[PDB]
Structure formats: structure tokens, C-alpha cells
PDB file of C-alpha atoms and ligand atoms in Angstrom:
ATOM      1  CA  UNK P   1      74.712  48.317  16.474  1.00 41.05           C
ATOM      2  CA  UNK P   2      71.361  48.206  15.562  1.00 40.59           C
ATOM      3  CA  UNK P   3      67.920  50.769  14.494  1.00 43.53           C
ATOM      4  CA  UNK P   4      66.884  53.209  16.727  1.00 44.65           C
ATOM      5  CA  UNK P   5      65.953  56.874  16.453  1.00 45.27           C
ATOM      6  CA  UNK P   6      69.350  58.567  16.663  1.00 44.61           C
ATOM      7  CA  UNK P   7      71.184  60.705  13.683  1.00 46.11           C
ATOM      8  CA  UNK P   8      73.005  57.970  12.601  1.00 40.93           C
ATOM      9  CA  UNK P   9      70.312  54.869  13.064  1.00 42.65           C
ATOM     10  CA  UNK P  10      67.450  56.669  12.531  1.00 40.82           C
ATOM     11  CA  UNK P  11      64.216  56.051  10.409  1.00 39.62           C
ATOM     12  CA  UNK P  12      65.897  56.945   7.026  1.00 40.55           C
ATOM     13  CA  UNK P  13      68.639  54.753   7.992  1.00 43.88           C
ATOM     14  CA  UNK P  14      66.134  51.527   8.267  1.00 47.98           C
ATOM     15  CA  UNK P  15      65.459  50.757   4.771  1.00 47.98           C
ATOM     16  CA  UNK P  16      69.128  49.045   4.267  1.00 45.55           C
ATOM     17  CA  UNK P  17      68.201  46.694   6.558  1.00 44.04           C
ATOM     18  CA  UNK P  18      64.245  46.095   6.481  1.00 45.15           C
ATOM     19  CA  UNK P  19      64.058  47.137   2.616  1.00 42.63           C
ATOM     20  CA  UNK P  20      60.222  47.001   3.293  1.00 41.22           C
ATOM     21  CA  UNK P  21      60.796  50.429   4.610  1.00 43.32           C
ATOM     22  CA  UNK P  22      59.713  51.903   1.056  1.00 42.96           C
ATOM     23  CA  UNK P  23      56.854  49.823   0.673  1.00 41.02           C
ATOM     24  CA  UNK P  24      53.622  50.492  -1.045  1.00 42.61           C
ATOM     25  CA  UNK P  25      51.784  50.487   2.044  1.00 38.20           C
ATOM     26  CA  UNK P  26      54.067  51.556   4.933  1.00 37.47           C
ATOM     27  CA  UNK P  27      52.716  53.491   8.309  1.00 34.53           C
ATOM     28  CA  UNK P  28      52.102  56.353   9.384  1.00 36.03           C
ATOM     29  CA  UNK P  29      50.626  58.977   7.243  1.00 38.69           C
ATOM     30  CA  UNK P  30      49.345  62.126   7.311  1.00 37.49           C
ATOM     31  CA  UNK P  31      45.482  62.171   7.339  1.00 36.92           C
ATOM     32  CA  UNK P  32      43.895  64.769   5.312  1.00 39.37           C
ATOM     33  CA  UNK P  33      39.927  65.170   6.429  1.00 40.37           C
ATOM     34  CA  UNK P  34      38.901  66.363   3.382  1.00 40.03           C
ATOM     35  CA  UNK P  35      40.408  63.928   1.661  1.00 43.24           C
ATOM     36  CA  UNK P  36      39.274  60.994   3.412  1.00 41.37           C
ATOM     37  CA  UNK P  37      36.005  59.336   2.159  1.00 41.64           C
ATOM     38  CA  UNK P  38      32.798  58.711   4.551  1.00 40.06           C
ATOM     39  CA  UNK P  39      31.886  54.901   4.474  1.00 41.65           C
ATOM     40  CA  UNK P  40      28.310  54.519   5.467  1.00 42.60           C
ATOM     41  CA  UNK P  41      29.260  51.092   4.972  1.00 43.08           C
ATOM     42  CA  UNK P  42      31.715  50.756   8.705  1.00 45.32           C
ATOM     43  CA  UNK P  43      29.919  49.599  11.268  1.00 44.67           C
ATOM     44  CA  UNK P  44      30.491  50.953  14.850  1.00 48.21           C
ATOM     45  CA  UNK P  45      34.046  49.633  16.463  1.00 45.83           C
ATOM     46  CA  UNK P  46      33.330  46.976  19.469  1.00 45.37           C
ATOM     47  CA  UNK P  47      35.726  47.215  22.199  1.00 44.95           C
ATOM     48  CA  UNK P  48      35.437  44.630  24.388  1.00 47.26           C
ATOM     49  CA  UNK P  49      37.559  44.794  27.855  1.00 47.62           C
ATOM     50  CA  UNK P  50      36.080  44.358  30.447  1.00 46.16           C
ATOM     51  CA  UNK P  51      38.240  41.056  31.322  1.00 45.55           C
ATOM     52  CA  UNK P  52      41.320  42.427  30.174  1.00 43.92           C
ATOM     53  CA  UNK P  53      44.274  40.865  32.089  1.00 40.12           C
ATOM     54  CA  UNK P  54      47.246  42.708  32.102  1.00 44.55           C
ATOM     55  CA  UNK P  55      50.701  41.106  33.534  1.00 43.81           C
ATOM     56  CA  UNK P  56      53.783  43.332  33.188  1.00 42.64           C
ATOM     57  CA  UNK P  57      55.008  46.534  31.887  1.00 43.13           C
ATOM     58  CA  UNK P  58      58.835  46.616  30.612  1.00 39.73           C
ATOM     59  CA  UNK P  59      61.370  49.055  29.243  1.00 41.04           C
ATOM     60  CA  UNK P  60      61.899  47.250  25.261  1.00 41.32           C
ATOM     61  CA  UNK P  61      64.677  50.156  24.872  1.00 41.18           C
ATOM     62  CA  UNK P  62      62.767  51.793  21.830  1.00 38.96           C
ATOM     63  CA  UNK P  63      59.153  52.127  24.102  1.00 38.23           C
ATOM     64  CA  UNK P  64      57.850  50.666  26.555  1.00 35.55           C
ATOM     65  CA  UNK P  65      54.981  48.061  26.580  1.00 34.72           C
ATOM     66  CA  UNK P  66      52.006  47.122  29.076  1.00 34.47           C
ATOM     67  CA  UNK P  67      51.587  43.344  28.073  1.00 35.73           C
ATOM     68  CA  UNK P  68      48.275  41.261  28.293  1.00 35.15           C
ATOM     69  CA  UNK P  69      47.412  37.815  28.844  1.00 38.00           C
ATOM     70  CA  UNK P  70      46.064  36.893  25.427  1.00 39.49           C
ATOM     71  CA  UNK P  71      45.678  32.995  25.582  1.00 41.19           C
ATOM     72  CA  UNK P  72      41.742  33.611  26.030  1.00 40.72           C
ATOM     73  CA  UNK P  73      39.495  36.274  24.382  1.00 38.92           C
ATOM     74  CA  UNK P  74      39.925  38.429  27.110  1.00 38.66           C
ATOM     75  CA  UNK P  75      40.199  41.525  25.795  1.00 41.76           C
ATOM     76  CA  UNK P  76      38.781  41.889  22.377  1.00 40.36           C
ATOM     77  CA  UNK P  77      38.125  44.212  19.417  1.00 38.46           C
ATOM     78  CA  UNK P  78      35.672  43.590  16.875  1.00 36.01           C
ATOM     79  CA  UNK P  79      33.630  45.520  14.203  1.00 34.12           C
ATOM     80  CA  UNK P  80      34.773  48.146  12.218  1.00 36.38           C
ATOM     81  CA  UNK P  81      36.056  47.427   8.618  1.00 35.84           C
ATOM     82  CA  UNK P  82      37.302  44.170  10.796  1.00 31.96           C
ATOM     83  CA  UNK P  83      36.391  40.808   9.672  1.00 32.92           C
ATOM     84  CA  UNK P  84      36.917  38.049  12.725  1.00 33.46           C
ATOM     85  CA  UNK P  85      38.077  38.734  16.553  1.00 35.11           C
ATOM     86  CA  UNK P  86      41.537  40.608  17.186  1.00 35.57           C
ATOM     87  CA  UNK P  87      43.134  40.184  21.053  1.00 33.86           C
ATOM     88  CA  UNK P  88      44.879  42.712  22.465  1.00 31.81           C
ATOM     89  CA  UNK P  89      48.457  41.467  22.991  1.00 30.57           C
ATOM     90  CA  UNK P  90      50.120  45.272  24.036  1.00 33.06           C
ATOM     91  CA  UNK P  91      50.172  48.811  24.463  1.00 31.57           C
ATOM     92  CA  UNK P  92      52.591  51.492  23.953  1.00 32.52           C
ATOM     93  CA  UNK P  93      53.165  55.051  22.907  1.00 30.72           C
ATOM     94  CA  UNK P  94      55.361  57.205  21.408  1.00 28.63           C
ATOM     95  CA  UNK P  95      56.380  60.714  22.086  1.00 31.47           C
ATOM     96  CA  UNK P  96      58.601  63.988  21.640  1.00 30.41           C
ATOM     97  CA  UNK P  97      61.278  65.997  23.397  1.00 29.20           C
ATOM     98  CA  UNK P  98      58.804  69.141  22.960  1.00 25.58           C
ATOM     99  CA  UNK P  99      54.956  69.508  23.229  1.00 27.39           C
ATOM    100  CA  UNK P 100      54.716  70.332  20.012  1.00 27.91           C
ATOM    101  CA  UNK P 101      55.601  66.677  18.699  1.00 27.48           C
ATOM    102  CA  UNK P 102      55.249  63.516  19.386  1.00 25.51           C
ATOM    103  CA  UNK P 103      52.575  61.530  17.560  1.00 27.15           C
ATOM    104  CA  UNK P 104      53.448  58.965  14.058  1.00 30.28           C
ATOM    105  CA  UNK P 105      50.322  59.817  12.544  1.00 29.50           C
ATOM    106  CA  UNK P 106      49.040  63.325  11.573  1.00 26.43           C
ATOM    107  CA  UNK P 107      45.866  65.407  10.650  1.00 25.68           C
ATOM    108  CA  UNK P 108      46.294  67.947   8.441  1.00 24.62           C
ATOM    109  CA  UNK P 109      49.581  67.944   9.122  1.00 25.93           C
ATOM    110  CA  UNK P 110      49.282  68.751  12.476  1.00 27.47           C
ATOM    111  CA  UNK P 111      51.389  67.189  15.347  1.00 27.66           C
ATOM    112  CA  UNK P 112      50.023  65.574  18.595  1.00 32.01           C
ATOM    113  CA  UNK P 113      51.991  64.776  21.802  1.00 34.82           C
ATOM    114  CA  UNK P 114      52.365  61.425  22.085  1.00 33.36           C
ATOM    115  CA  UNK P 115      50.069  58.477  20.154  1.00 31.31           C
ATOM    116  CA  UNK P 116      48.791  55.758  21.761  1.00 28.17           C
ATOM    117  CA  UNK P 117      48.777  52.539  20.223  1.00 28.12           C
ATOM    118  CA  UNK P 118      46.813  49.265  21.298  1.00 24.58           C
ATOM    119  CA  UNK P 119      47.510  46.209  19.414  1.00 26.74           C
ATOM    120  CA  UNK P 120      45.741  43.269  18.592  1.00 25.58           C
ATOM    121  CA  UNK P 121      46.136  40.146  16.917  1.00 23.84           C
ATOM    122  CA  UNK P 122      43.553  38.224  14.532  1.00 23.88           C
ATOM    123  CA  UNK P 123      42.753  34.483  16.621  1.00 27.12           C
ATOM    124  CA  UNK P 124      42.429  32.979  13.106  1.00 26.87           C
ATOM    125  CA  UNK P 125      46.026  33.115  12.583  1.00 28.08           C
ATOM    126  CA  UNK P 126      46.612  31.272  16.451  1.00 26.44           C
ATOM    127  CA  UNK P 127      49.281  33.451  17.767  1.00 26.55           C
ATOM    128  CA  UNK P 128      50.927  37.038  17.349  1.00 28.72           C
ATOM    129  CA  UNK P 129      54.273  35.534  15.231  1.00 28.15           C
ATOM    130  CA  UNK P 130      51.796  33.956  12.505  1.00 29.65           C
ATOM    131  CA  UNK P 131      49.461  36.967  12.504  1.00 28.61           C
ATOM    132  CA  UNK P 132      52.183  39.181  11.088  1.00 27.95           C
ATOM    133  CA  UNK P 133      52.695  37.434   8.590  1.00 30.66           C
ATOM    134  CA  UNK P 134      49.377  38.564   6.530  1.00 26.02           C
ATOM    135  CA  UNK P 135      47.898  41.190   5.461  1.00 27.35           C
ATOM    136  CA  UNK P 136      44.989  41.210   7.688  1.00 33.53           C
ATOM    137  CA  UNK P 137      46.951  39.941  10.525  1.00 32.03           C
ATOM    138  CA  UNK P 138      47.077  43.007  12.804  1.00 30.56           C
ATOM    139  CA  UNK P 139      44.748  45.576  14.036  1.00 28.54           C
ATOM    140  CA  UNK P 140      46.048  48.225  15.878  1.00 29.22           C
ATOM    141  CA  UNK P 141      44.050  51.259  17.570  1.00 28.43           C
ATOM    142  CA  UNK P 142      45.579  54.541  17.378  1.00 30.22           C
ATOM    143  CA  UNK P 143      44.919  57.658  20.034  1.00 31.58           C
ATOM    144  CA  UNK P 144      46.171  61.319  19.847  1.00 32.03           C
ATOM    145  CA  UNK P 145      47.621  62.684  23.457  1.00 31.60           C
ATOM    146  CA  UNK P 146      47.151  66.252  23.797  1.00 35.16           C
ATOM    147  CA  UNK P 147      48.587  68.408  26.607  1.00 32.59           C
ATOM    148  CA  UNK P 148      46.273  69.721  28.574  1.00 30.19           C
ATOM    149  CA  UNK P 149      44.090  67.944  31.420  1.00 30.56           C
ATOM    150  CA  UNK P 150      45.891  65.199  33.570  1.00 29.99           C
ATOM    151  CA  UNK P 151      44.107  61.864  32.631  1.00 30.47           C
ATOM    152  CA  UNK P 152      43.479  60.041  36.107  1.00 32.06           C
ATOM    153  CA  UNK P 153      43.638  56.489  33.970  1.00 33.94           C
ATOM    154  CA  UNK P 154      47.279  56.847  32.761  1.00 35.95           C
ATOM    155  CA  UNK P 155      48.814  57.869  36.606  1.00 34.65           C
ATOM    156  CA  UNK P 156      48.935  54.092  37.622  1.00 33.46           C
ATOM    157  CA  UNK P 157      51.646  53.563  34.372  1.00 31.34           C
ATOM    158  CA  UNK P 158      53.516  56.940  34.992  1.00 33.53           C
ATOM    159  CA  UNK P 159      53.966  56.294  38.263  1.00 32.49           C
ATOM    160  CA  UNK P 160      56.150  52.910  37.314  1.00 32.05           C
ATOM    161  CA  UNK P 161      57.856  54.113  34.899  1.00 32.24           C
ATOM    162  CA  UNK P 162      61.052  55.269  38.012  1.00 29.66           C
ATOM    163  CA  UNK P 163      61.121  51.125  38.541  1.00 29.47           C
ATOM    164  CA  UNK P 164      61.669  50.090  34.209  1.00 28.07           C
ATOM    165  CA  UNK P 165      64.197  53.457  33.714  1.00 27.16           C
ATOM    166  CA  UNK P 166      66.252  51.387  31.349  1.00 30.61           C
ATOM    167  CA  UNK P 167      66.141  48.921  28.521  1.00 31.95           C
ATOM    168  CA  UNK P 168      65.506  45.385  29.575  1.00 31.18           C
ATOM    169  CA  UNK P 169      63.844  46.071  33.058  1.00 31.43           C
ATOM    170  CA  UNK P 170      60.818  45.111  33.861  1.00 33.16           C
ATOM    171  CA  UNK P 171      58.045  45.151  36.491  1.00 29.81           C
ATOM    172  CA  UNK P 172      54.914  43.033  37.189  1.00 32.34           C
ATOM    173  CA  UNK P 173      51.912  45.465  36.449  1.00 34.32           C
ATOM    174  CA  UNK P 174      48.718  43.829  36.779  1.00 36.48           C
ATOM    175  CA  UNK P 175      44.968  45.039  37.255  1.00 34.54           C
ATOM    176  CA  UNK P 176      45.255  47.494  34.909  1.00 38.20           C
ATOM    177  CA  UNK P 177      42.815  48.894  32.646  1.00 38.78           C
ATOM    178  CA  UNK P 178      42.815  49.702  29.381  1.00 39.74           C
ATOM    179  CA  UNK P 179      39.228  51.364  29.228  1.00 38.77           C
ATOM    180  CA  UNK P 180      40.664  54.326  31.218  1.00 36.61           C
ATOM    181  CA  UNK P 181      42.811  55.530  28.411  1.00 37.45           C
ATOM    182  CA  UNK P 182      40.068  55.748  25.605  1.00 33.92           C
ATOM    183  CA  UNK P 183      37.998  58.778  24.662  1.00 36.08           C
ATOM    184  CA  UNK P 184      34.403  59.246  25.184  1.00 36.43           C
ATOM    185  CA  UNK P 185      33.888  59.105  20.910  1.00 35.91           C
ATOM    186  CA  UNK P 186      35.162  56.359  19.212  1.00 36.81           C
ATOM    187  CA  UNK P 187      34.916  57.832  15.614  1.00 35.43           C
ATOM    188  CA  UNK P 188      37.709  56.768  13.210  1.00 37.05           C
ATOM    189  CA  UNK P 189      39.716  56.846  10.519  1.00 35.83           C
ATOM    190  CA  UNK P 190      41.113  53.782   8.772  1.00 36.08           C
ATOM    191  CA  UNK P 191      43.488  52.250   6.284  1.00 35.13           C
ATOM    192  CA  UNK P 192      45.818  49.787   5.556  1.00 35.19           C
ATOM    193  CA  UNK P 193      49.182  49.701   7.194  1.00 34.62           C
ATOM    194  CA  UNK P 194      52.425  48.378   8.765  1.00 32.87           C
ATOM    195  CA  UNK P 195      54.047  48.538  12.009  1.00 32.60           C
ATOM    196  CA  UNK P 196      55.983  52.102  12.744  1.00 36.52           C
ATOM    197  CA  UNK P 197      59.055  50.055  13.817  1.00 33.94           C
ATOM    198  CA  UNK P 198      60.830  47.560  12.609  1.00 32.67           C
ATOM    199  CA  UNK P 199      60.346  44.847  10.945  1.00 32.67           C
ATOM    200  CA  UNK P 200      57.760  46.972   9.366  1.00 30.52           C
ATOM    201  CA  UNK P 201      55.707  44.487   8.044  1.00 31.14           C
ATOM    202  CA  UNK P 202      52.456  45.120   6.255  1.00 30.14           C
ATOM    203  CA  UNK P 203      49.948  43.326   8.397  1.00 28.11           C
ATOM    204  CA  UNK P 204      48.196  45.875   9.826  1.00 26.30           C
ATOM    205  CA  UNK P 205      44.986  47.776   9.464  1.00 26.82           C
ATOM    206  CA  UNK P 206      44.642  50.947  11.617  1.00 27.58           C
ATOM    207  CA  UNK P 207      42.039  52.476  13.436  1.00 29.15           C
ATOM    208  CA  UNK P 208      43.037  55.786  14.739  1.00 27.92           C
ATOM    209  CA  UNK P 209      40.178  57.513  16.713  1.00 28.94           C
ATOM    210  CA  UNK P 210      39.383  61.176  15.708  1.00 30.84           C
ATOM    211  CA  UNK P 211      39.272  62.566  19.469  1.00 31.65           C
ATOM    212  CA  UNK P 212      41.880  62.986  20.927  1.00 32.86           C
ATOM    213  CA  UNK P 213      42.868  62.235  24.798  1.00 30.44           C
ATOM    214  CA  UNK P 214      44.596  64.864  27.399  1.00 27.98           C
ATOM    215  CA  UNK P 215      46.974  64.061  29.949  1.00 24.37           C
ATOM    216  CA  UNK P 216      49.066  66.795  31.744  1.00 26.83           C
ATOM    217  CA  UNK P 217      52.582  68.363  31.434  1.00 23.39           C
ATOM    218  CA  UNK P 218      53.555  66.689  34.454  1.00 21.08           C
ATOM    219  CA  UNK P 219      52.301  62.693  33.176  1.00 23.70           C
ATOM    220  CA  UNK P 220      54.005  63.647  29.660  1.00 24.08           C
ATOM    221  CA  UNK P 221      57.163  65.246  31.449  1.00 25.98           C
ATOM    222  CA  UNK P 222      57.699  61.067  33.023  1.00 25.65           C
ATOM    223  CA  UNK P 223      57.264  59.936  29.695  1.00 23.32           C
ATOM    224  CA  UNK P 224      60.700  61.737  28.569  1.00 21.69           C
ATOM    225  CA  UNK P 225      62.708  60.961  31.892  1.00 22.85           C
ATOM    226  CA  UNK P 226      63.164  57.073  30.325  1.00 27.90           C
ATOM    227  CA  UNK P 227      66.163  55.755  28.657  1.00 28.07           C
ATOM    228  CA  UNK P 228      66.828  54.150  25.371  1.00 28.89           C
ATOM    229  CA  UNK P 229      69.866  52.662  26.999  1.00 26.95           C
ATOM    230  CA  UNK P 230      70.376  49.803  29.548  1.00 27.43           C
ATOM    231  CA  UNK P 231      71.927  50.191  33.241  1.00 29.19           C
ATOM    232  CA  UNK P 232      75.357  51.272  33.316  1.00 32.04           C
ATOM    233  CA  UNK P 233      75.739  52.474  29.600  1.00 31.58           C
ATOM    234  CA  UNK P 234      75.768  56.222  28.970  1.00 32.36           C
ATOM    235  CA  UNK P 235      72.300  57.785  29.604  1.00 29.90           C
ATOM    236  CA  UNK P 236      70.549  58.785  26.349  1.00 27.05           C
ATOM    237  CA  UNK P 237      67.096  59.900  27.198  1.00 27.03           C
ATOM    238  CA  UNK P 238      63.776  57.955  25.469  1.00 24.42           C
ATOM    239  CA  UNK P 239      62.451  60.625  23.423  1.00 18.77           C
ATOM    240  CA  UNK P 240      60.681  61.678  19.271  1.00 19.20           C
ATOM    241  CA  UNK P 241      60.659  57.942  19.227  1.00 21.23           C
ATOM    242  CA  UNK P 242      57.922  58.362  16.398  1.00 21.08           C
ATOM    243  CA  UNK P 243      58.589  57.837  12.996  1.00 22.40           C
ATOM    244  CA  UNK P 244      57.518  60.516  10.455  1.00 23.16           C
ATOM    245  CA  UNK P 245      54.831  60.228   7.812  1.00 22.73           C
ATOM    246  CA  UNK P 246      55.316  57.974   4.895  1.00 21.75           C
ATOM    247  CA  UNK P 247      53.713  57.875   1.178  1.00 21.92           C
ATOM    248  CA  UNK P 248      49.856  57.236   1.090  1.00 22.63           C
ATOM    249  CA  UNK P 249      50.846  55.763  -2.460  1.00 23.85           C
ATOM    250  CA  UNK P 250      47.732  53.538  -3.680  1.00 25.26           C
ATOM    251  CA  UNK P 251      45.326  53.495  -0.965  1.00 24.68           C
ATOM    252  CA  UNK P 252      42.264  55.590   0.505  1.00 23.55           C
ATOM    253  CA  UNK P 253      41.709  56.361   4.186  1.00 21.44           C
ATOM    254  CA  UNK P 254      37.893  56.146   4.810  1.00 22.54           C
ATOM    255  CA  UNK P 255      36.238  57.879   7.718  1.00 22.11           C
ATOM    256  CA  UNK P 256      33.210  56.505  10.108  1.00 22.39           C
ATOM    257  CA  UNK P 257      31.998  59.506  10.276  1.00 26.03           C
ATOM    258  CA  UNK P 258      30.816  62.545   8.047  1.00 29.24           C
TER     259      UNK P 258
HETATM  260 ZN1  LIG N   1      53.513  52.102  17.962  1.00 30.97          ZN
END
């Protein structure tokens, strides 16, 4: 018995036992545009992967991740309102059981697919476990799927997805790369955040890019044909693993752009 995103272990079932679930500065939220304040101050985001490395893709039970070598500055992001050098560690997404949701964070209120989210881990902490642990410790970039186009970078992880069908499998996936899943603009929004899942800690501060990224019925379809469970327990398909808007509370989102 543990969290999940079922009626009876759901998100507002997680505060009584990661009481940091009603926190002052919990993830996601709902983005208003005209709320959100233009910082001429943000310099332009620096994504750096070219030498990204990735080594295996596996089925964690609540998403699945795309894992990189990060032992090197490989593959890098810098700039933004970031201070230092963040290293991508992962990758995953989360998505609905209908077009029509899918995505944690929202714009105007309005729903995406699925939401992309790469994240990366500040070297000046030395590894991922440490990084957590403060407030600037994370950096995680945030992209909106849209149904629409297929996206020819994403076929290469839905076609894998048949060999990780249930929790605990995994499968080497190397060669991979990330660049093919970004969008032509990278204008943001940003604020300071958590993680979506548990333990929810306040370490992060998001980036999540204004344009959004389109991949097909068909590549989103794969996406909801995984399984929360593990082999031989009852099948209970992986979907609206996304966890809705929380508070904004004390904090301003400020935008790159204007
Ligand atoms: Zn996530």
C-alpha cells in the first residue's frame, strides 16, 4: 500500500504521508499570462546536449524514465534565472486517459496532453540525493504535448515502451537524444517549485517553455497502453498520472518574454 493516482491513493490522499503536500510553494500551478510579470532581467536559457549519454529507459510504476549518464557535464542546462550548471539526470512525462488532459501545469486554465519534464541537478550540491535537499537544488524543464503532428524524435521511446509494459522492467536505451523533443522557441515561464510526486520536496525551480510540442494520436495512444502494475498482478492501465494545480500562495511567475 502505497501513493499512486487511484480513488483511494490519490493526490489528495498524499498529504498524510508527505505533509509537505500543503506547502507554501508546492508544484504545479496554473499559469495565468496576464498575470505573469516580463523580466527583462532573464537571460536566454542554454541547453547544452550535444554529448548527452543516455543508458536505459524503465517502467518506475508511476511513469516511466529515460535515464542519463550524469557523472560528467554531459548534458547541461545553464542560464535562465539559473545560477551555476544543472545535469540532466532524467526524463519523463505525464499524461491522460482523454486528449483533453494530461499535462500538471496549466495556462489559463487550459489542459495539454501530456507534459514533458527534463530534470536536472545543480553539480554544486555533488549528486542528485544532496541536490534535493535545497532550495535551489533542482531545475526541471517543462514542455506542453499537443495532439496533432507525429513528432519523428519521440518514435524511438514509443516504440519500447511493448518491452517495459510493467512496473520494474527495464530496457537498455542508449543513443538517444534529447534535442529531438524540444520546440523550435525556447521562451519561458518560471517560478519556484517542488516535485509533482512524492516526496514533494521544494527544491525545484521550473522552466516550462511557452510552445508547445505535437506528437500524434497514435505516439500518445502507446503512452496509455502501460501499466501501473507489475507482471502477473491485475492490469491497471498507466494513465491522468498528473497531479492537479496547487496554490500559487506567495510567489510570482515571471515570463522571458513580453
Ligand atoms: Zn514530472
Amino acid at each position: 500500500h502505497h501513493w499512486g493516482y487511484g480513488k483511494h491513493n490519490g493526490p489528495e490522499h498524499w498529504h498524510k504521508d508527505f505533509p509537505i503536500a500543503k506547502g507554501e510553494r508546492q508544484s504545479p500551478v496554473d499559469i495565468d499570462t496576464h498575470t505573469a510579470k516580463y523580466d527583462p532581467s532573464l537571460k536566454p536559457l542554454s541547453v547544452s546536449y550535444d554529448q548527452a549519454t543516455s543508458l536505459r529507459i524503465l517502467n518506475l510504476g508511476h511513469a516511466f524514465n529515460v535515464e542519463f549518464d550524469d557523472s560528467q557535464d554531459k548534458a547541461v542546462l545553464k542560464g535562465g534565472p539559473l545560477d551555476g550548471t544543472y545535469r540532466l539526470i532524467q526524463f519523463h512525462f505525464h499524461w491522460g486517459s482523454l486528449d483533453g488532459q494530461g499535462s500538471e501545469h496549466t495556462v489559463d486554465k487550459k489542459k495539454y496532453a501530456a507534459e514533458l519534464h527534463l530534470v536536472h541537478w545543480n553539480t554544486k550540491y555533488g549528486d542528485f540525493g544532496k541536490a534535493v535537499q535545497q532550495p535551489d537544488g533542482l531545475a526541471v524543464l517543462g514542455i506542453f504535448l499537443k495532439v496533432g503532428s507525429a513528432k519523428p524524435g519521440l518514435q524511438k521511446v514509443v516504440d519500447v515502451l511493448d518491452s517495459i509494459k510493467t512496473k520494474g522492467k527495464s530496457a537498455d536505451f542508449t543513443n538517444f537524444d534529447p534535442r529531438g523533443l524540444l520546440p523550435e522557441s525556447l521562451d519561458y515561464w518560471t517560478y519556484p517549485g517542488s516535485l509533482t510526486t512524492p516526496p514533494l520536496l521544494e527544491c525545484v525551480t521550473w522552466i516550462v517553455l511557452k510552445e508547445p510540442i505535437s506528437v500524434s494520436s497514435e505516439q500518445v495512444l502507446k503512452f496509455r497502453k502501460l501499466n501501473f502494475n507489475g507482471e502477473g498482478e491485475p492490469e491497471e492501465l498507466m494513465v491522468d498520472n498528473w497531479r492537479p494545480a496547487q496554490p500559487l500562495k506567495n510567489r510570482q511567475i515571471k515570463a522571458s518574454f513580453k
